[PDB]
Amino acid sequence: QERMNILQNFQYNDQINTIFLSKVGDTSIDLPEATCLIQISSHYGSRRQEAQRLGRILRAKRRNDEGFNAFFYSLVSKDTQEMYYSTKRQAFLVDQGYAFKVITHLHGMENIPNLAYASPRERRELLQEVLLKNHPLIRKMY
Amino acid sequence: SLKHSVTQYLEEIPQQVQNRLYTSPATCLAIYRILPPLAKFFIMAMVFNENEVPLLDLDKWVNSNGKLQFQNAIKSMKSLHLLIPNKSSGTLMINLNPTFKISLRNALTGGEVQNSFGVVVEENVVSLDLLDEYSANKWETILHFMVGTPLAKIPSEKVLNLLKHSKLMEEVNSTGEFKITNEGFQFLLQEINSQLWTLLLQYLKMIETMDLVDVLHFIFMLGALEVGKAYKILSETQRIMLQDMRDYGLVFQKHSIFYPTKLALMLTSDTIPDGSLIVETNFKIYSYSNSPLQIAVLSLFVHLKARFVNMVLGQITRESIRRALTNGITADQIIAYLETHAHPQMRRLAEEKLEKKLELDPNCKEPLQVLPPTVVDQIRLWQLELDRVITYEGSLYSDFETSQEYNLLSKYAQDIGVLLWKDDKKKKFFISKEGNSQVLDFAKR
Ligand SMILES: [Mg+2]
Numbered sequence: 172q173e174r175m176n177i178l179q180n181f182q183y184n185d186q187i188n189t190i191f192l193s194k195v196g197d198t199s200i201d202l203p204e205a206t207c208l209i210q211i212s213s214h215y216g217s218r219r220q221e222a223q224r225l226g227r228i229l230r231a232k233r234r235n236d237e238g239f240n241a242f243f244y245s246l247v248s249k250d251t252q253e254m255y256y257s258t259k260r261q262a263f264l265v266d267q268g269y270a271f272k273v274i275t276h277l278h279g280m281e282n283i284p285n286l287a288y289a290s291p292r293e294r295r296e297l298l299q300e301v302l303l304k305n306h307p308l309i310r311k312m313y
Numbered sequence: 314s315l316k317h318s319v320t321q322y323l324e325e326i327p328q329q330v331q332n333r334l335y336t337s338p339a340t341c342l343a344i345y346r347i348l349p350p351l352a353k354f355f356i357m358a359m360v361f362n363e364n365e366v367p368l369l370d371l372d373k374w375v376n377s378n379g380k381l382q383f384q385n386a387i388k389s390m391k392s393l394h395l396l397i398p399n400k401s402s403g404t405l406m407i408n409l410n411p412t413f414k415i416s417l418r419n420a421l422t423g424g425e426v427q428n429s430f431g432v433v434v435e436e437n438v439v440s441l442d443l444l445d446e447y448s449a450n451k452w453e454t455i456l457h458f459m460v461g462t463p464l465a466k467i468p469s470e471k472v473l474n475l476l477k478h479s480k481l482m483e484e485v486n487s488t489g490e491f492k493i494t495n496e497g498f499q500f501l502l503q504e505i506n507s508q509l510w511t512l513l514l515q516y517l518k519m520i521e522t523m524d525l526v527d528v529l530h531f532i533f534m535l536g537a538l539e540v541g542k543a544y545k546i547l548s549e550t551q552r553i554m555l556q557d558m559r560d561y562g563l564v565f566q567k568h569s570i571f572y573p574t575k576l577a578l579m580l581t582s583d584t585i586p587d588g589s590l591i592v593e594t595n596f597k598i599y600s601y602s603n604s605p606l607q608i609a610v611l612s613l614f615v616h617l618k619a620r621f622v623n624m625v626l627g628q629i630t631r632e633s634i635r636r637a638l639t640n641g642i643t644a645d646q647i648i649a650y651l652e653t654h655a656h657p658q659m660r661r662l663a664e665e666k667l668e669k670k671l672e673l674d675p676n677c678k679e680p681l682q683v684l685p686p687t688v689v690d691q692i693r694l695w696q697l698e699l700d701r702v703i704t705y706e707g708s709l710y711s712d713f714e715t716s717q718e719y720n721l722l723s724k725y726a727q728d729i730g731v732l733l734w735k736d737d738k739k740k741k742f743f744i745s746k747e748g749n750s751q752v753l754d755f756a757k758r
Contacts, residue, residue, distance in 0.1 A: 238673050270594040270687040273694060 198223045203232040207242045215256050218263040221245075225264065245271075315507050315582060316347050318514060320389065326525070328394045332412060334526045335395075339429040339534035341416035343581055344393070351375070351386035356395070359409045360417045368398070368407045429534060434543035434570050444540060444565060448574040451562025453606055460501070461492060462609035472512075472560045479515045493613065495641040501610055502650060506579055512561060513580075523550050531555070535563070536581030538573040545570055589656045592684040596629040596691075601656070613637050614647055629688070634695045644696040648689055655683040705733055706746040713740050725755045 174195075181190045182204050197220055208228045214220045228241045247257045261271055288294045323331070323344070335341050345356060355371055375383040390396040395413050399406045419426055438444065455472060457464040459482050467473075476482045477491075481500060484491040493501075500511055513532060520528055527550045535558075538544055546569055547555070555571060558564045563580075565572045588607050590600035598615050600607065601624045608625055611617070614637035617627040637647065663681050670677070682689070713719035719740050726732035731748025735741070744752050 265595060268594065270685060272687060273690050 194220075196227070200227065201230060202227050203230050206231050206233075206239075208244065210245045212246075212253070213260070216259050218260050221260045222263050222267075225269075315510060318507075318510060320347055320393070322514060322517070324392045330526060331394050332410070334529060335410060335412045335416055337429040337530055337534070338416045338420035338426055339537050340530055341413055342420050343533040343536060344395075345417065346582060348389055348393075348395075349382070349386050351379075351382050352390050355386070355390070356409070356417075360414055360421070363414075365399075365406050365408050368405045371407065430537055431534070431544040434545050436543045436570065437541055438543075438572060440541035440575075444572060444574045447565050448562040448576050451560075452576065455561065456501075456606055457609055458491075459493065459497065460606075460609045460613065462605070462612070469560050471557050475512065475516055475519055478519065481511075481515075492640050493642070495643060495646075498613075498637075498642045498646050498650075502646065502653075505576070506583070509561075509563075509576060509580060523554075527551060528554060531558075532580070535573060535577050536579075538577060540573050540575055540578050543570045543572060585657060586654075588654045590651070590654055591656045591659065592629075592651055592688055594685055594687055596688065598625075598627040598629060600625050600627070600654075613640075614642065629692075631695060634692060635699065638696060638699050644693050647692060648684075651688075652683055659683045705743075707733065707744050708746070708749050709741060709743050710752075711739075711741050716740070722752065722756055726752050 177190065180187050182202075194214065205228050208224065210221075210224065213224075225243055228243060231239070231241050233239055234241075245257060245261070247253045265271070288297055326334070335344075345353060348356065359366065371387075372383065387396070391398065395410050397408050397410055399408055418424060454464060454466055455468050458468050459476065468476075477484050480494060480496045482491050482497055483494045500508060503511070517525070517528055517532075527548050530548075531551050531554050546552075555564065555566075559566060561576075563574060563576050565574060585601055587604065588600065588602045590598055590602070590611070592598065598611070600611055602608070602611075603623060608617070608620070611625070611627070614629075614633050615627045616630045616633040617625060619626055634644075634647070638644070660681075660683050663683055667681050710722070713722070723732060723735055723742050726742070726744055726748070729748065729751055731744050731751055732742060733745055734743045
């Protein structure tokens with residue numbers, strides 16, 4: 172009930188335009204209004220997960236208007252095993268024909284007013300928190 | 314850079330040597346074709362008149378719009394010393410070199426030439442079957458020995474010596490092998506006309522004591538010769554020169570008469586495609602080329618998987634690119650080879666994308682890319698991976714008694730451009746090993 176209510180709000184309400192889904196909605200879910208997708212971190216080396224999740228934004232209702240291009244991002248940490256997993260999981264889309272573009276830097280990202288954990292103090296606070304993660308008569312008496 | 318290269322070499326030659334060079338009409342005719350169009354126009358006017366023209370008169374011919382071209386033309390002619398500026402009677406008179414004027418006059422009017430263009434024996438040979446095959450194979454063999462692909466008949470010592478000492482195909486005895494360098498890939502990229510001059514120009518610098526003019530004399534008239542004809546035999550130095558010419562597949566001898574080849578004629582700046590390949594998102598290469606030379610050059614940075622008679626199919630891999638990068642081939646060069654050897658189909662689809670891009674928004678006109686941008690990004694990214702670590706050799710300075718001394722020593726190093734890194738808080742700075750002595754010398758002083 173709750174997820175459906177969130178899903179309905181995300182679709183028919185202009186106030187909410189973004190949702191944070193998990194592996195639950197990775198398959199056989201119809202989201203015609205979805206156009207943009209972001210994947211902060213995901214299921215290791217699994218390939219079908221990458222393709223099936225990409226299928227959510229392939230449902231775009233406005234897929235025929237001129238100049239429309241759905242967006243599919245995969246944020247990967249540099250110098251980490253995620254690169255090994257990331258290059259392995261997207262090995263099915265390349266076979267289909269989709270090509271991945273490397274974005275080393277996002278233009279205009281520094282001019283944004285506020286960003287998460289900008290000051291060193293906030294960054295260290297996050298570091299410590301993540302590091303720290305691991306007889307009916309008797310009844311009347313009382 | 315063909316006319317620039319040949320012209321630049323001539324400028325460096327001393328004027329005393331240039332005067333002797335212009336003796337033969339043949340070389341003068343070849344040198345005449347190298348000057349800019351405006352220079353040729355003035356030269357032709359001055360060759361047939363035995364008089365003196367003031368400098369200003371030639372300027373009057375050039376229109377106001379083409380005034381800039383006049384400066385380049387006069388500068389080029391003066392540098393070669395073809396034009397002799399003489400000042401007298403308060404005016405800067407202009408005259409042509411007497412040797413050059415006579416040399417050109419004989420060639421055009423058919424005067425005494427002293428067999429500069431050679432003689433005809435009237436004993437011709439089939440050009441297609443023999444001349445084309447011999448030079449093509451001989452030029453093919455040297456190229457294969459340069460790209461590193463195995464080949465039975467290795468080139469002779471003469472050309473082998475030239476290649477080594479030159480920047481081409483750096484070799485090391487400890488390694489015991491020969492590999493291509495950054496300039497070597499460019500040499501392969503350059504068209505045949507520029508490919509031939511690079512070897513010839515390097516040879517001209519290699520010869521010692523053999524006269525510089527004589528070697529230049531032989532080379533220039535060689536182009537004047539017409540393929541598929543006989544030419545009886547010349548200077549004593551030209552004899553050993555002629556035999557050495559056979560090593561490069563420019564002239565064919567049975568064992569008295571020498572026959573020029575297609576390359577010989579091509580030397581004098583003569584005016585689907587083979588090598589075209591398909592680059593796509595899947596990093597798969599499909600080169601519609603049937604020739605070992607094209608296959609060998611592709612293997613430098615392409616992991617070949619199989620070959621058909623019509624084409625060769627392969628795949629770009631991280632290992633293949635790193636192999637080329639380690640030798641010294643730059644990524645920018647690799648993309649240039651891919652772009653200049655593109656398939657016609659790729660251009661059409663790219664143009665179709667451009668046409669649709671213009672249709673949606675014609676306000677943006679970016680340079681079209683024949684091959685998908687993803688391949689470019691990955692190839693360059695791999696280059697960044699190899700340049701991930703940057704290291705410099707040198708020494709470190711520390712424990713300065715006074716801050717003024719540290720600033721003075723650091724300031725001088727910056728002045729002579731030997732200071733790499735410095736930190737004011739630690740009063741430390743690192744300098745390159747090349748300028749280590751200079752900084753130490755200033756420390757004593
Ligand atoms: Mg379904």
